[PDB]
Amino acid sequence: KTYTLTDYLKNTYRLKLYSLRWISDHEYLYKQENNILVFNAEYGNSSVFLENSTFDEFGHSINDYSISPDGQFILLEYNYVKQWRHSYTASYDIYDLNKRQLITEERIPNNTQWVTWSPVGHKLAYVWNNDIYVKIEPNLPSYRITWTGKEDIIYNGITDWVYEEEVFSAYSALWWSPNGTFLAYAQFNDTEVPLIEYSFYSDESLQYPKTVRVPYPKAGAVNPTVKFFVVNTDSLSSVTNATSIQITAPASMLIGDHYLCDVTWATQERISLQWLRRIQNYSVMDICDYDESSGRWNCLVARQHIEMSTTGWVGRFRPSEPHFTLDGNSFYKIISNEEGYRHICYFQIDKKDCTFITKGTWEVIGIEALTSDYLYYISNEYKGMPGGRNLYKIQLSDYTKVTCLSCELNPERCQYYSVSFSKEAKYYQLRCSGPGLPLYTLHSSVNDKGLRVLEDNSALDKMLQNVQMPSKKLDFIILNETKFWYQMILPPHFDKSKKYPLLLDVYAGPCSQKADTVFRLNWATYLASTENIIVASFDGRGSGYQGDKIMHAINRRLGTFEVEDQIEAARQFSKMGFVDNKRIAIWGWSYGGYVTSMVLGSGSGVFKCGIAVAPVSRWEYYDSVYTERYMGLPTPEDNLDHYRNSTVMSRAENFKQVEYLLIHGTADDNVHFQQSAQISKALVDVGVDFQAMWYTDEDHGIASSTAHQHIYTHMSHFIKQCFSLP
Amino acid sequence: RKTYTLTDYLKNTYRLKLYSLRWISDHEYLYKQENNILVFNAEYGNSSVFLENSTFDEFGHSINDYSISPDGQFILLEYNYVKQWRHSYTASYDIYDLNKRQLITEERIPNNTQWVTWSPVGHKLAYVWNNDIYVKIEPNLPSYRITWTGKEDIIYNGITDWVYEEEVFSAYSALWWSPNGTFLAYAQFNDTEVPLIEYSFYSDESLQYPKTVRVPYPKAGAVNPTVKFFVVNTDSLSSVTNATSIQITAPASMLIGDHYLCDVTWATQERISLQWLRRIQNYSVMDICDYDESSGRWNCLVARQHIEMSTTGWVGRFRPSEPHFTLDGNSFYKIISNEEGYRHICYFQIDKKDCTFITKGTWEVIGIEALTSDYLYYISNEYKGMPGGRNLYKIQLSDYTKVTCLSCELNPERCQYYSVSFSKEAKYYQLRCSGPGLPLYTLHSSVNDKGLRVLEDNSALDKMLQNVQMPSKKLDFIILNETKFWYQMILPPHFDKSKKYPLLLDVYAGPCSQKADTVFRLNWATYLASTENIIVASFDGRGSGYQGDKIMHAINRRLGTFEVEDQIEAARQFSKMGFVDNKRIAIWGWSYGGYVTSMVLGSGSGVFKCGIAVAPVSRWEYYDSVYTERYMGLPTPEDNLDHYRNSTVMSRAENFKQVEYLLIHGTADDNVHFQQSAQISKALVDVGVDFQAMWYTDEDHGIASSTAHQHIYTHMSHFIKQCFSLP
Amino acid sequence: SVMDICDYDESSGRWNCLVARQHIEMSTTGWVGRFRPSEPHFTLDGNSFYKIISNEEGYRHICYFQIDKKDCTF
Lengths: 726, 727, 74
Ligand SMILES: *[C@@H]1O[C@H](CO)[C@@H](O[C@@H]2O[C@H](CO)[C@@H](O[C@@H]3O[C@H](CO)[C@@H](O)[C@H](O)[C@H]3NC(C)=O)[C@H](O)[C@H]2NC(C)=O)[C@H](O)[C@H]1NC(C)=O
Ligand SMILES: *[C@@H]1O[C@H](CO)[C@@H](O[C@@H]2O[C@H](CO)[C@@H](O)[C@H](O)[C@H]2NC(C)=O)[C@H](O)[C@H]1NC(C)=O
Ligand SMILES: CCc1nc(CC(C)(C)C)c(CN)c(-c2ccc(C)cc2)c1CC(=O)O
Ligand SMILES: CCc1nc(CC(C)(C)C)c(CN)c(-c2ccc(C)cc2)c1CC(=O)O
Ligand SMILES: *[C@@H]1O[C@H](CO)[C@@H](O)[C@H](O)[C@H]1NC(C)=O
Ligand SMILES: *[C@@H]1O[C@H](CO)[C@@H](O)[C@H](O)[C@H]1NC(C)=O
Ligand SMILES: *[C@@H]1O[C@H](CO)[C@@H](O)[C@H](O)[C@H]1NC(C)=O
Ligand SMILES: *[C@@H]1O[C@H](CO)[C@@H](O)[C@H](O)[C@H]1NC(C)=O
Ligand SMILES: *[C@@H]1O[C@H](CO)[C@@H](O)[C@H](O)[C@H]1NC(C)=O
Ligand SMILES: *[C@@H]1O[C@H](CO)[C@@H](O)[C@H](O)[C@H]1NC(C)=O
Ligand SMILES: *[C@@H]1O[C@H](CO)[C@@H](O)[C@H](O)[C@H]1NC(C)=O
Ligand SMILES: *[C@@H]1O[C@H](CO)[C@@H](O)[C@H](O)[C@H]1NC(C)=O
What we know:
Chain A: One of its GO terms (cellular component) is apical plasma membrane. Chain A: It is a single-pass type II membrane protein. Chain A: Keywords: Aminopeptidase, Cell adhesion, Cell junction, Cell membrane, Cell projection, Disulfide bond, Glycoprotein, Host-virus interaction, Hydrolase, Membrane, Protease, Receptor, Secreted, Serine protease, Signal-anchor, Transmembrane, Transmembrane helix. The structure is cut from a larger assembly and holds 3 copies of chain A. The first copy, chain A, is an alpha+beta fold. Chain A folds into 2 domains: 468 residues, Dipeptidylpeptidase IV, N-terminal domain (Methanol Dehydrogenase, Chain A, 8 Propeller), CATH 2.140.10.30; 258 residues, 3-Layer(aba) Sandwich (Rossmann fold). Helices cover 15% and strands 34% of the residues of chain A. Chain A has an 8-stranded mixed beta sheet, with helices on both faces. In chain A, β2 and β3 form a beta hairpin. In chain A, α7 crosses α8. Chain A starts with a helix and ends with a helix. The structure holds a molecule of 3 linked components (NAG-NAG-NAG), a molecule of 2 linked components (NAG-NAG), the ligand CCc1nc(CC(C)(C)C)c(CN)c(-c2ccc(C)cc2)c1CC(=O)O (2 copies) and 2-acetamido-2-deoxy-beta-D-glucopyranose (8 copies).
């Protein structure tokens, strides 16, 4: 038997996880059953901590919970209503975590946007109607920090649509000081930001469709503006409104449109801020000390470090974050070296030049932990594979003596790692993501030895024994003296003397990686296991984790090299002799939707057919922060010419050679239906037949249980027919 | 050799020729030739060139349409045509003088003018601009502002709001001149509490943010626009003072709740008839209103009121029918359902309560086309007992039993569908013939009744078409409970009853619909029948029109029931007929038809393999109030909510697992909103049924754009071909 | 009246006057200046300037301004 569509859609063969949240440097929590238990590692044992049926009589079903770092209060989250990718709305209730009695008075209000404990003690910070509130005790009246909060126009301590999606990847824009004395926050001003407007059809009982109006800056439009503040949570009278000390952006930033792109505390009294110019090739970091006598914040002009880029933009998606030594007089941050590669720099607060603590033809992925002895980080060095993740440990006292940690713990099963550290890194967890079944293991960083297996996924392993699973290749091809990596999802009982159809699974967007060592049970698994379709993905120009030379390649030049490199990919695959040339398809979601569209638009005649889900159609339609990073401004004096040369509409005439499926959710707040509306219109006008599917009230995820089920069924029907599959 | 292909249909290969004339006097009409516009003498035809097409080019715009003043002195010129809804649009206007030689330059008609009309004699103008009414006594003089209240999307003076345009007046105009252009009567519509349908218009790829279009549109049960009525006196317009308009208020029984103004007809120089309709559309009232000098006001005497009601259904076919006053205005004729339920001509006296019927029978009068003093002229489907035929009749007024069929016999093989254009006092008439053969336009005298000349016999079209293998049309009936129900079939050429043909059921099936008729058409079906060998059939079952009230009011308060079942029963009778492949029977429709199709596909009947729904209604709460409520009453617990509730297509989603479905809809459909199809797709996704969708960006209800018209038919053609396993 | 202080940004090529370097001069008893606001005399480094302004007794005296501080000293 094979891994069917219903198997993927009903999640029969489930990957097991080990999610743990460290309350301390010793103990973590795990939902094992329905209820929460406290685990250790010092003698190794564990005990039952609390039940989801200690709050059975609560009345509601809790969406999430939160522990107050001191361990005295639990914060229960229910009435969850989703907004965008991260933003949402909930009701919150607090318990005296000891007595497990509900805190009855001064309750946190319904319709709260964000809530967060101080890193120590049990202070609260919440956002409600775009305003910031603070609760020193979970049973005392809140202290109202901001008063400017206005729906859709002024966000205090939460992000607007674009800062949520592209800049912070979070709703909240609040940052407590290490020891909970100071609360920093951003305030976003959407006043002149244009609204995207779209209909929401709602339940069928809704007679007249609603119009949703999100302030959303499309490429070139009036962006939001941002101010930054710090407030002292201790000294906080009720007799007088709380005064909030502003920190303005540096001069070189105030001179034109800009973004606040990083917030990192250093000590109780030191905060660091990274600002980005709207043209995202220049970025500045301010370090700001508190003044005990002023009550104010001073960022020294000489202390300003600058992150520049003349080959492309800055960062991978945003400038990298700093990690501060305990004294706060020094920090490490991942940056690009003189020849492309992204490595860790040791900055001395009181000067300009870092020195690189790493070098070579491989990028560092992220800094995971810092002690005053070593520095822990993830990279793709092992076996010079960019699609692999391994955990490394570098000695601060000697930068040349770098010991690996994960790489060889299990080489065959495990080439892709992530790590969750304890509260001071006395222990750490390893998520192995593949290419074998995910493996979760608890280690001690004391003597770097392994403690125990947390999840070896043998349960899933056992019921995958009588399934004919797809296999997976992961290898490079050389193009113009460059290693370009691809992956293949090969059908079981693969026979390279046979000719298999192929689906090119494309994302291809800036700094992407579709060819990795990650193990996945997805739609491609069904396609190979059942339909005997090879599913392949190729990391061409503009993909990530290979240096600035490959990644910046598409700078100001989207819809070119990454599009062209996807076609060349197929040519290479087919010319490996196991591919039916006559049956090659292409598909992608979001950016990949755009690339698929572009390829089917290119007229190369490699591709028989293709699917594009929520594609971009022309870059002016997508949002400023993302689009402008790689494209610039759509003005005649910048890149308006190329914005025009990259629209899918302009290639409508070419879709006559291909069978095409275009799918889009009508309530897609991210990639707007508009984009697909313009593709279809463009196609109609040249007289090309294609398939279409809108999804009423689905967003960019098309993630409703029933919609998800439907879109994959539909696409399966499409691909099979295109492929003459019975 | 060859057949009627898709490109044929789509590229308009075999054109159909019309003869679009405009009467101007009693003996003369206008036609266009080399683009040159000529006047013809009906008696002789010694036709001279009226206005050669070289006069308007250096003038430098696009002459979309034109209009002569009735006295013949001035030509109105329409340009910058920008469409609103079905009828409503906006344009710039220049006036051209024949006598003074050149065009007018001073006090010019505004850009963005909503509507323009001449007085019925002379050369007065009345126009609406920015929802307000203006009058030009002389094309060159300043205009007198009649109304100061008009506010965009809210107060509509002399033009209709969305619903009144589509549903009541089938016009953008709410202006009616008195016969000799002395009085200007108008309606004012208020949409203050009318909710707005809102939808994205996407425009050119150059528009960065989609525009939200917003339109006052009462859905079933929603707050309706209100209506007031006025008459102004144009001869007594003062420059020094604001012109006063006299309000005629609706009768007591109408103000007692929501209502509509449905009809406006001037009777005489100083007499107007107004028909009002209750919101529950089974009770309507006609007011005859006379001017009174010594008061200045208008009086509609209670004793001259005329109630027109229905207990089986609604009043009228779609609206109460219009009066036809005798020259002296003391009497009128109108089509009303009789005691048998058949629509016939009733003769009414202003100063009396009962009418007397002057036609009767098991058939219906379609329209009163002319009324002289010797003859009533009317179109009916009496001939041969074919409800799908239309012929011309004259009633000898002096003895209404003496009736003559003017068109029946002229050419009974070629011609059984007719319409008529009468000259101003009916001295002459154009007869248009629309089927079953090729269209035929003929010009006639009323005195002798002799045919004068063939204006257009489509021989040009006949020439090419005898090389093409064309489908026949069979028009017949089947008997269901000793009731005849008619169908038509577009039969592939060389049709063989030994063979089993795939069948496509072409469905409208709205109230008072008629899909089975004698009209000749060149459509998508002509292609399916000729090229693909699909039998396409249509069937007029219960709810359908021109066959009496018993059949038409059968769906009263019960939409999405009998008209749906009768479509299913049709196909059954069509299989049972012996020349139909059971395994290949599809169904498709547009508007109401799209609703029926969807309702049939979800039926569980299992008769139908696959179906196509274009811009369907999904549930009746989504459609406009005056159409829907005519048939459904209000969606309330007190009226007809349960049935609104049972008659949605969404509640049948589960059953779509049984058919192959294609659901198509334009996004800028202001009529049946894209909403309706959004809710269908969503209901289908929710029960895990696979269907096919196609949205059309910025298209409206007609999906009428050149390229979008071609696209949708090509798309449908592929769906049908696959469903029927055609290569 | 408002004194803007504008710097040439090298990478830009453009000129920029930061709002925090804006200096306001106004009068409640009449017009600002003798016939126009007074001209600034900058110290060599550009960071400071002297200016004749009316003092709180309506007497025109030399005030010492810092580019960043709103308030001067006479
Ligand atoms: C978010 O940004 C908005 C600008 O996009 C800010 O709104 C501006 O603030 C000004 C002061 O409140 C407005 O009015 C000015 O008021 C002064 C008072 O003395 C008058 O002299 C000015 O003539 C007057 N300006 C005008 C043109 O009326 C601005 O008009 C106003 N701009 C807007 C709303 O578009 C918001 O205050 C800001 N919010 C926060 C808290 O940062
Ligand atoms: C259009 O209709 C509205 C009612 O929907 C009328 O507005 C009312 O005006 C009267 C004044 O006599 C007020 O008492 C009401 O409060 C108003 N209603 C609302 C909610 O606006 C208005 O009179 C109508 N306009 C015209 C031209 O007749
Ligand atoms: C991890 C998924 C993701 N995350 C992000 C946000 C970060 C880049 C910060 C991570 C973005 C940027 N909006 C996208 C994205 C969306 C649309 C397009 C045209 C391009 C990129 C995606 C892809 C997706 O939503 O499917
Ligand atoms: C002849 C065209 C037409 N004219 C009219 C207007 C009158 C009935 C007054 C004549 C209407 C009524 N809105 C419709 C119609 C539209 C939608 C629906 C659900 C039902 C009926 C159509 C059908 C169409 O638009 O194709
Ligand atoms: C929130 O929900 C409802 C208000 O409709 C009410 O029963 C309850 O008191 C509210 N609770 C809080 C925490 O304010
Ligand atoms: C705080 O500020 C707001 C408006 O700025 C004001 O209305 C309110 O009274 C103030 N509250 C206190 C306690 O001063
Ligand atoms: C209408 O439009 C044209 C072109 O903009 C212009 O010549 C004319 O003066 C405008 N207005 C009037 C009053 O017709
Ligand atoms: C007529 O009425 C309008 C609006 O009521 C008023 O403003 C105006 O004074 C009058 N028009 C003239 C010019 O007499
Ligand atoms: C038009 O009709 C009105 C009202 O009957 C009357 O005053 C006038 O005589 C008529 N004018 C002409 C020219 O017929
Ligand atoms: C008989 O009456 C009608 C005739 O119009 C027919 O369509 C229907 O099937 C029958 N009715 C019932 C309920 O038997
Ligand atoms: C960033 O990009 C621009 C546009 O290509 C380029 O001219 C320059 O290198 C950078 N601009 C600035 C102001 O730093
Ligand atoms: C400037 O003058 C105006 C008008 O005389 C007056 O309202 C105001 O007092 C003055 N403003 C200032 C800033 O003194």
